[PDB]
Scaffold this active site. Structure first.
Site, mmCIF file in Angstrom:
data_model
loop_
_atom_site.group_PDB
_atom_site.id
_atom_site.type_symbol
_atom_site.label_atom_id
_atom_site.label_comp_id
_atom_site.label_asym_id
_atom_site.label_seq_id
_atom_site.Cartn_x
_atom_site.Cartn_y
_atom_site.Cartn_z
ATOM 1 N N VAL A 52 -29.335 -16.579 -22.596
ATOM 2 C CA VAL A 52 -28.038 -15.912 -22.802
ATOM 3 C C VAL A 52 -27.953 -15.071 -24.079
ATOM 4 O O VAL A 52 -27.115 -14.150 -24.147
ATOM 5 C CB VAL A 52 -26.875 -16.931 -22.787
ATOM 6 C CG1 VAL A 52 -26.819 -17.737 -24.087
ATOM 7 C CG2 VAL A 52 -25.552 -16.231 -22.481
ATOM 8 N N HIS A 60 -44.636 -12.986 -22.773
ATOM 9 C CA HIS A 60 -43.935 -13.208 -24.040
ATOM 10 C C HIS A 60 -44.205 -12.054 -24.969
ATOM 11 O O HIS A 60 -45.357 -11.649 -25.122
ATOM 12 C CB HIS A 60 -44.447 -14.499 -24.646
ATOM 13 C CG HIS A 60 -43.614 -15.047 -25.769
ATOM 14 N ND1 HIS A 60 -43.421 -14.384 -26.948
ATOM 15 C CD2 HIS A 60 -42.974 -16.260 -25.879
ATOM 16 C CE1 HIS A 60 -42.681 -15.165 -27.753
ATOM 17 N NE2 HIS A 60 -42.410 -16.312 -27.100
ATOM 18 N N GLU A 80 -40.700 -24.242 -22.027
ATOM 19 C CA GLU A 80 -41.658 -23.129 -21.994
ATOM 20 C C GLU A 80 -43.085 -23.619 -21.870
ATOM 21 O O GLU A 80 -43.928 -22.968 -21.203
ATOM 22 C CB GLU A 80 -41.505 -22.236 -23.218
ATOM 23 C CG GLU A 80 -42.524 -21.118 -23.368
ATOM 24 C CD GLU A 80 -42.105 -20.202 -24.481
ATOM 25 O OE1 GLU A 80 -42.630 -20.348 -25.616
ATOM 26 O OE2 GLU A 80 -41.220 -19.369 -24.251
HETATM 27 O O1 URM Z 1 -27.067 -24.632 -28.329
HETATM 28 C C1 URM Z 1 -27.644 -24.064 -27.387
HETATM 29 C C2 URM Z 1 -29.008 -23.846 -27.410
HETATM 30 C C3 URM Z 1 -29.616 -23.204 -26.338
HETATM 31 N N1 URM Z 1 -28.834 -22.789 -25.255
HETATM 32 C C4 URM Z 1 -29.398 -22.116 -24.069
HETATM 33 O O2 URM Z 1 -30.850 -22.245 -24.129
HETATM 34 C C5 URM Z 1 -31.429 -20.932 -24.161
HETATM 35 C C6 URM Z 1 -32.741 -21.063 -25.021
HETATM 36 O O3 URM Z 1 -32.456 -21.306 -26.412
HETATM 37 P P1 URM Z 1 -32.639 -20.215 -27.493
HETATM 38 O O4 URM Z 1 -32.213 -18.903 -26.973
HETATM 39 O O5 URM Z 1 -32.031 -20.732 -28.742
HETATM 40 O O6 URM Z 1 -34.276 -20.283 -27.647
HETATM 41 P P2 URM Z 1 -35.348 -19.172 -27.872
HETATM 42 O O7 URM Z 1 -36.312 -19.338 -28.975
HETATM 43 O O8 URM Z 1 -34.923 -17.786 -27.510
HETATM 44 C C7 URM Z 1 -36.347 -19.615 -26.406
HETATM 45 C C8 URM Z 1 -37.476 -20.668 -26.680
HETATM 46 O O9 URM Z 1 -37.160 -21.859 -27.504
HETATM 47 C C9 URM Z 1 -36.439 -22.917 -26.897
HETATM 48 C C10 URM Z 1 -36.138 -24.018 -27.928
HETATM 49 O O10 URM Z 1 -35.312 -23.478 -28.977
HETATM 50 C C11 URM Z 1 -37.290 -23.493 -25.783
HETATM 51 O O11 URM Z 1 -38.535 -23.984 -26.332
HETATM 52 C C12 URM Z 1 -37.547 -22.396 -24.750
HETATM 53 O O12 URM Z 1 -38.374 -22.967 -23.752
HETATM 54 C C13 URM Z 1 -38.250 -21.167 -25.425
HETATM 55 O O13 URM Z 1 -38.436 -20.055 -24.526
HETATM 56 C C14 URM Z 1 -30.317 -20.103 -24.796
HETATM 57 O O14 URM Z 1 -30.488 -18.698 -24.563
HETATM 58 C C15 URM Z 1 -29.102 -20.621 -24.068
HETATM 59 O O15 URM Z 1 -29.058 -20.161 -22.707
HETATM 60 C C16 URM Z 1 -27.467 -23.002 -25.238
HETATM 61 O O16 URM Z 1 -26.779 -22.644 -24.286
HETATM 62 N N2 URM Z 1 -26.889 -23.642 -26.314
#
Ligand code: URM
Ligand code: URM
Ligand code: DA8
Ligand code: DA8
Ligand code: MN
Ligand code: MN
Lengths: 277, 277
Positions: free
Chosen positions: A142, A163, A233
């Site tokens: 999101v 990625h 991931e």
């Molecule tokens: O409080 C929250 C926390 C998360 N979310 C939901 O989880 C999605 C991923 O988290 P984020 O974007 O922080 O990670 P990024 O670093 O962009 C995404 C990466 O790191 C994650 C852990 O922080 C996982 O490891 C994931 O698999 C990896 O791709 C976020 O877009 C929200 O849809 C939410 O709704 N409320």
């Protein structure tokens, strides 16, 4: 299923002795297209998918403070995501009242699904209707905005996204889970690509298979007192190593301009990180 | 349908910033792979298709004097066509007694189907068992020999093969049917590729759709007192313009070395013309 004939179309002839792109790999070694700008004629693809009355579901989680990202996410999705096609957004949140009222184009709908204050993989696979309502599922972060076209060129039975931090890296440098005690374990001599957890999808059946497998693997790890280095991931990467995706999206589809700029190899930045943390 | 996990495999990492081939188009504008040597890892593909216990049917017609081509066709198929996979040859002939006794590898069978002294399209679609016996159908000319690997890299719901005479040609030079009175008519401003009638295939369902459509179109032409310039090939071209193939085979898969030599762009000559007429 039966596919009617395409109508007459006038477009440039593809030329066999002229590649679309010479700077990048456009097909994987298992003959899955890698989707870059210049590789597809969107008019042909739009015809093909409209003739099937394709419906695309988009899942997005907005829990706790991340509800703040919904307005820009949804408003830019309306400008750029599957325009002309049937779209059903599924917004999973702990705060239904915080979901912004966003105006949608015709043929598009939004459902707010309340969840409690593994969650994404578990919720997508066994909670969630999808088989009855959509043909494909697209599952995204999101904390993002659409800046350019994201359309039916991505649709296929199963896809992952390269990625943006690692598309030029050798596999030994990939941040796969490296502990053999984890279900997500991948040895240093294995791996095709490092896929980001923030954009995957496919047919409903294949997305349910992926999310079920990842949820089950994460539960095994929990029972064994281990959490994979990059959480869902890491499991997504293990699944896509063992079940090859039928398309791979280039980093046009998942980019962070603040962190990584705008390299020459990206002709478009389509879906991009918004500042958080 | 359910696909089990691939086993661990050790192979070279695909590199995103290194194309497999820079000299040729390896994906169509509708995101179908174009199959050239260097684009696929056959070990990955063989694993994928063996895990599905894939059975490939091969149809070939040997009528009148063309029964003379069967021995070399079949003996070289045994050396090069889908080795390791289940294969069912269907030999359609007016002279069952003239079919040579060819020794087959394990998991391979041959059926002789007698026909009378439109035929191929009609016979494949409504005479011919295929739905019960094979997963894919491959439909080829008999006046040919295999010289190199032809394997599961070709399999997909629907494929055609680039005609060796025209892969570098512009569409206005393609020998499509140009008379608007024919069902096979294609205007000078339409066309992706010129496909050869001598090698096409796909899933049984898609091959039955193609052959049924072409047979019906040929019957309409007959009723209207017109025969398309290149007979079933003209209709095949019309069908594949309007129903895009999900893979396209390069001319490695249909070549005539006497007429066209061995260009640099062909790293392998896989299935080649034998002298006739
Ligand atoms: O409080 C929250 C926390 C998360 N979310 C939901 O989880 C999605 C991923 O988290 P984020 O974007 O922080 O990670 P990024 O670093 O962009 C995404 C990466 O790191 C994650 C852990 O922080 C996982 O490891 C994931 O698999 C990896 O791709 C976020 O877009 C929200 O849809 C939410 O709704 N409320
Ligand atoms: O007496 C016969 C004549 C044909 N056949 C069968 O038909 C196939 C095509 O014919 P041919 O190879 O001569 O055409 P080519 O030029 O290689 C193939 C091309 O020209 C054809 C007409 O001669 C059609 O137009 C076809 O659509 C096109 O691809 C041949 O391989 C045999 O399996 C047979 O069994 N007995
Ligand atoms: C190598 C140089 C680092 C490249 C970027 C690393 O991004 C982070 O990669 C992690 C896996 O190793 C995991 O996917 C989180 C990811 O960080 C996310 O994505 C980045 C592009 C940024 O948007 C970052 O803020 C976000 O948390
Ligand atoms: C342009 C230069 C001519 C290139 C070869 C033409 O091949 C012929 O093409 C026809 C359609 O225009 C049709 O498919 C028959 C095809 O001739 C067959 O295939 C050739 C490669 C030769 O093997 C020939 O003997 C065979 O009849
Ligand atoms: Mn994120
Ligand atoms: Mn022939």
């Amino acid at each position: 299923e039966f596919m009617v004939s395409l109508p007459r179309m006038v477009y440039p002839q593809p030329k066999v002795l002229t590649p679309c792109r010479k700077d990048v790999l456009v097909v994987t070694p298992w003959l899955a297209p890698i989707v870059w700008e210049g590789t597809f004629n969107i008019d042909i693809l739009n015809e093909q998918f409209r003739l099937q009355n394709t419906t695309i579901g988009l899942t997005v989680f907005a829990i706790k403070k991340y509800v703040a990202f919904l307005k820009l996410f949804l408003e830019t999705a309306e400008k750029h995501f599957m325009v002309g096609h049937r779209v059903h957004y599924y917004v999973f949140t702990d705060q239904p009242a915080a979901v912004p009222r966003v105006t949608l184009g015709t043929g598009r709908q939004l459902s707010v699904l309340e969840v409690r204050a593994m969650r994404r993989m578990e919720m997508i696979s066994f909670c969630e209707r999808f088989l009855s309502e959509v043909d494909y599922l697209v599952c995204v972060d999101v904390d993002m905005e659409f800046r350019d076209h994201v359309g039916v060129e991505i649709l296929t039975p199963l896809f992952g996204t390269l990625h943006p931090g690692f598309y030029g890296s050798s596999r030994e440098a990939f941040t796969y889970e490296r502990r053999p005690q984890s279900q997500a374990y991948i040895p240093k001599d294995e791996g095709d690509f490092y896929y980001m957890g923030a954009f995957f999808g496919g047919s409903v059946q294949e997305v349910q298979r992926l999310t079920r497998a990842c949820h089950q693997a994460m539960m095994v790890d929990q029972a064994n007192g281990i959490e994979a280095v990059w959480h869902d991931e890491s499991h997504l990467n293990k699944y896509l190593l063992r079940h090859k995706p039928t398309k791979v999206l280039s980093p046009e589809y998942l980019w962070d301009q603040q962190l990584l700029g705008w390299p020459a190899v990206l002709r478009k930045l389509r879906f991009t990180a918004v500042p958080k943390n």
